[PDB]
Amino acid sequence: HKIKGTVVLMPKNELEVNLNAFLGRSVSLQLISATKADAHGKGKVGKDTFLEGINTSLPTLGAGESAFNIHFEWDGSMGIPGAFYIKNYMQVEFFLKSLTLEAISNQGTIRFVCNSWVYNTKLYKSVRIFFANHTYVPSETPAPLVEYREEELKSLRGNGTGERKEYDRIYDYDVYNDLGNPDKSEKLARPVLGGSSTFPYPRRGRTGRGPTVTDPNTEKQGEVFYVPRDENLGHLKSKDALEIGTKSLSQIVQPAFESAFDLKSTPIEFHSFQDVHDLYEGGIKLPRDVISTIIPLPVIKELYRTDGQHILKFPQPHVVQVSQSAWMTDEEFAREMIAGVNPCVIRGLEEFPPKSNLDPAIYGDQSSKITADSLDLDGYTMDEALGSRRLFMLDYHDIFMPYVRQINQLNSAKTYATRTILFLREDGTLKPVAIELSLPHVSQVVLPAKEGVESTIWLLAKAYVIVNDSCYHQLMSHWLNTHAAMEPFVIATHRHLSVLHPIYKLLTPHYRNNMNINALARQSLINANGIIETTFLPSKYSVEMSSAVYKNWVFTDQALPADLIKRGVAIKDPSTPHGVRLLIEDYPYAADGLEIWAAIKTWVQEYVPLYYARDDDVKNDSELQHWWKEAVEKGHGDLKDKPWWPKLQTLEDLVEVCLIIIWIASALHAAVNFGQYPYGGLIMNRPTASRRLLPEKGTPEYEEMINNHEKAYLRTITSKLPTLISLSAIEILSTHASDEVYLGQRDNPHWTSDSKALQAFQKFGNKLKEIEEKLVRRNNDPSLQGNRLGPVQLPYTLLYPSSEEGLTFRGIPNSISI
Numbered sequence: 001h002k003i004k005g006t007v008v009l010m011p012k013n014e015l016e017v018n019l020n021a022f023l024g025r026s027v028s029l030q031l032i033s034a035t036k037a038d039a040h041g042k043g044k045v046g047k048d049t050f051l052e053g054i055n056t057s058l059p060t061l062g063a064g065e066s067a068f069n070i071h072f073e074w075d076g077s078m079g080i081p082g083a084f085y086i087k088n089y090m091q092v093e094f095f096l097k098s099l100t101l102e103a104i105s106n107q108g109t110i111r112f113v114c115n116s117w118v119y120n121t122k123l124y125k126s127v128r129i130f131f132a133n134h135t136y137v138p139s140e141t142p143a144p145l146v147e148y149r150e151e152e153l154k155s156l157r158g159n160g161t162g163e164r165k166e167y168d169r170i171y172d173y174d175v176y177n178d179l180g181n182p183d184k185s186e187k188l189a190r191p192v193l194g195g196s197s198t199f200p201y202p203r204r205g206r207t208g209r210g211p212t213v214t215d216p217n218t219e220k221q222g223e224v225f226y227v228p229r230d231e232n233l234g235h236l237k238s239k240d241a242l243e244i245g246t247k248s249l250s251q252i253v254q255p256a257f258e259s260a261f262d263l264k265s266t267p268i269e270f271h272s273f274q275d276v277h278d279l280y281e282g283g284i285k286l287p288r289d290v291i292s293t294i295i296p297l298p299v300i301k302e303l304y305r306t307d308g309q310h311i312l313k314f315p316q317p318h319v320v321q322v323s324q325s326a327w328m329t330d331e332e333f334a335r336e337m338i339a340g341v342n343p344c345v346i347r348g349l350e351e352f353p354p355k356s357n358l359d360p361a362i363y364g365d366q367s368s369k370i371t372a373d374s375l376d377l378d379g380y381t382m383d384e385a386l387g388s389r390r391l392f393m394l395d396y397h398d399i400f401m402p403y404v405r406q407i408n409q410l411n412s413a414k415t416y417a418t419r420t421i422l423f424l425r426e427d428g429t430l431k432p433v434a435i436e437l438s439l440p441h442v443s444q445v446v447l448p449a450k451e452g453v454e455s456t457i458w459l460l461a462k463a464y465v466i467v468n469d470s471c472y473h474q475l476m477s478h479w480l481n482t483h484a485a486m487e488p489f490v491i492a493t494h495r496h497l498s499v500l501h502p503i504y505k506l507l508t509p510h511y512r513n514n515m516n517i518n519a520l521a522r523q524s525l526i527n528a529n530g531i532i533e534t535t536f537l538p539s540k541y542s543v544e545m546s547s548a549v550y551k552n553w554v555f556t557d558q559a560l561p562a563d564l565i566k567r568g569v570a571i572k573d574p575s576t577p578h579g580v581r582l583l584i585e586d587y588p589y590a591a592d593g594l595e596i597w598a599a600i601k602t603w604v605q606e607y608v609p610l611y612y613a614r615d616d617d618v619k620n621d622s623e624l625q626h627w628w629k630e631a632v633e634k635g636h637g638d639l640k641d642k643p644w645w646p647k648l649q650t651l652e653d654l655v656e657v658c659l660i661i662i663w664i665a666s667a668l669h670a671a672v673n674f675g676q677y678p679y680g681g682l683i684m685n686r687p688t689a690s691r692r693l694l695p696e697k698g699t700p701e702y703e704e705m706i707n708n709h710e711k712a713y714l715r716t717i718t719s720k721l722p723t724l725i726s727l728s729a730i731e732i733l734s735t736h737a738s739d740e741v742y743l744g745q746r747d748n749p750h751w752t753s754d755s756k757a758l759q760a761f762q763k764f765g766n767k768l769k770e771i772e773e774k775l776v777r778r779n780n781d782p783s784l785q786g787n788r789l790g791p792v793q794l795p796y797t798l799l800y801p802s803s804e805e806g807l808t809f810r811g812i813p814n815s816i817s818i
């Protein structure tokens with residue numbers, strides 16, 4: 001007869017960085033039948049129904065939320081509602097949370113989970129439609145809803161043309177042709193990444209602003225880089241809009257810092273290690289007009305403590321919280337390769353010497369010059385060490401050698417291509433035993449030393465290694481393997497899986513804020529003269545170097561067990577719980593990771609069978625098949641010919657693909673992202689650039705090395721000004737916003753009506769709490785102190801599932817959210 005409903009929404013003002021106006025004829029809803037169809041087979045549509053009154057007597061409401069009453073006339077000819085249209089006649093958009101229809105019983109309640117911005121009706125080509133929270137593979141869709149389902153998908157795809165506007169909900173692909181700024185200056189031209197065999201690259205979200213005047217292949221600049229509207233996350237609290245901090249850092253803060261150095265208001269260079277420690281003790285003193293430009297900015301103002309006049313004070317990095325000098329030890333240098341910011345590059349060594357795969361015609365003999373007899377392996381012979389699998393390496397030789405010549409031509413950059421040899425001691429810790437520093441076209445081996453000028457040469461050798469590692473970490477482990485690799489799957493999901501689809505509901509929580517942070521990164525982080533180019537060694541070659549590495553990116557090798565085996569740090573072993581035996585038993589990233597991997601695997605294995613009983617059902621799901629086809633052939637289309645792509649013809653394939661996607665977006669990104677300021681907030685520990693080669697004997701640079709090793713170090717690594725910018729950047733990227741959604745959580749508890757899926761999700765969340773307790777016990781186990789805490793006394797918490805807000809060195813978000 002009449003159906004009572006409650007609409008929950010958020011006015012615009014609540015999510016930026018008058019309630020009676022919603023009443024009257026301002027907002028119309030029309031219910032759509034799931035069971036009665038018109039003559040053309042489409043669900044019957046009801047009459048325009050308007051919000052009747054405010055509902056303050058609702059206790060479930062959250063911050064910024066308002067609830068409205070509504071009553072629908074729905075007679076016996078109309079059936080059961082499964083969807084609704086909404087039309088906003090106001091001039092201002094609002095954020096629609098939910099619609100709930102009440103019935104005589106609690107089972108007869110129908111829930112609509114919306115979470116979508118609704119703009120004025122005149123801006124939309126099609127009326128906004130929303131579905132109830134029932135889950136349906138395509139063949140199970142109630143017949144009267146079939147055409148609505150497909151038409152909404154078509155609306156989300158668009159036609160591949162047009163400039164995208166703020167309120168568009170159109171997902172499509174384009175190449176990375178929007179990073180250069182040639183119309184401003186020819187020196188800001190950058191290669192188009194993607195769509196060629198020279199520069200393969202994952203696609204990003206299409207924006208459609210059109211060509212520059214000087215280069216038809218490059219996309220012109222804009223003040224706002226479009227993302228589909230519901231990707232562009234609002235926040236209740238402006239301090240949680242961390243993603244906009246990078247834009248302010250580049251466009252406002254960096255020019256202000258630069259002015260202070262131009263005017264010689266502060267020393268241009270660090271002169272001692274104390275000058276660096278000062279940054280988080282008494283602070284750095286800057287002119288008042290610089291401070292007054294910085295501290296009124298949202299987000300930016302949270303990065304520093306200030307006296308309001310002259311002081312900016314950075315927070316104390318975790319890595320120096322117990323020992324100011326432990327970072328200099330060989331033990332910590334080695335330990336951070338398995339428990340640091342970038343713990344996933346080290347490889348097992350099964351032959352010696354290590355060899356290069358580079359073309360000898362271009363580079364020279366590239367056989368390693370390290371000799372077995374020069375190494376102190378704690379009394380082991382090389383034969384013994386290899387055979388017991390105690391030798392490991394951090395090999396950046398082949399990755400960097402193709403670019404060293406171009407980098408070293410730049411004015412203030414000089415680098416080597418490095419290899420580091422590591423030995424696994426009988427006590428279970430890694431020992432660095434040699435570093436090889438190579439140039440193309442002298443190339444030196446450096447051995448550990450604790451005394452004399454040689455100990456300084458060794459300290460500098462470690463710095464060149466970490467410059468390699470930092471660049472690889474930021475551009476490859478972090479930017480390429482998580483942010484960039486994931487965006488094509490986000491695009492494909494929205495274009496081809498209905499909101500009704502079980503796999504849409506499984507994956508989309510692991511996409512939150514991903515396209516948004518990436519678009520802001522294209523604008524201010526990885527663009528020409530952006531933050532990365534300004535602060536990291538390779539300058540304008542940074543992003544294209546990640547294209548060279550993408551040539552070898554393999555989707556199925558992103559699975560954690562596969563990665564460990566590929567790198568030779570584990571072996572296949574069915575006698576173990578996880579199917580792999582670690583060659584470095586105490587390996588913190590891998591040992592904790594395997595626990596998280598297994599819990600996600602169990603969740604996916606218990607969810608997929610709820611909707612697919614047999615391999616046939618996977619093959620016959622046309623949305624799933626279109627989704628995976630497009631993700632590979634367009635989204636990662638430069639690699640579409642590779643044989644290792646799963647074909648998605650079996651349940652096992654579907655589980656594997658979903659598990660890998662969830663892994664990349666949650667635990668992998670967390671493990672490489674949230675340690676950036678904790679380890680790298682001391683620039684000497686994680687230098688981002690090197691500016692000169694090793695001094696030659698008999699030069700004043702060499703004499704300086706003998707008499708003042710701290711100054712020799714600081715002249716080698718990142719200069720003070722880029723240090724200040726990069727520390728601010730990585731402080732932002734290392735912070736959890738207070739509205740983060742962590743692994744095992746979801747934003748709405750009624751995301752599906754299927755009680756079976758809800759219970760399996762409850763079990764997943766409980767397992768994560770069990771694992772966190774297990775990991776806590778590992779960090780309290782004295783036998784594992786050597787690798788989990790190290791000389792820096794910093795327990796490895798980066799894979800604890802839960803976290804409070806802030807710069808916490810722990811917590812696994814669902815998604816690539818920062």
Ligand SMILES: [Fe+3]
Pocket residue numbers: 478483669673733816818
């Ligand atoms: Fe990130």
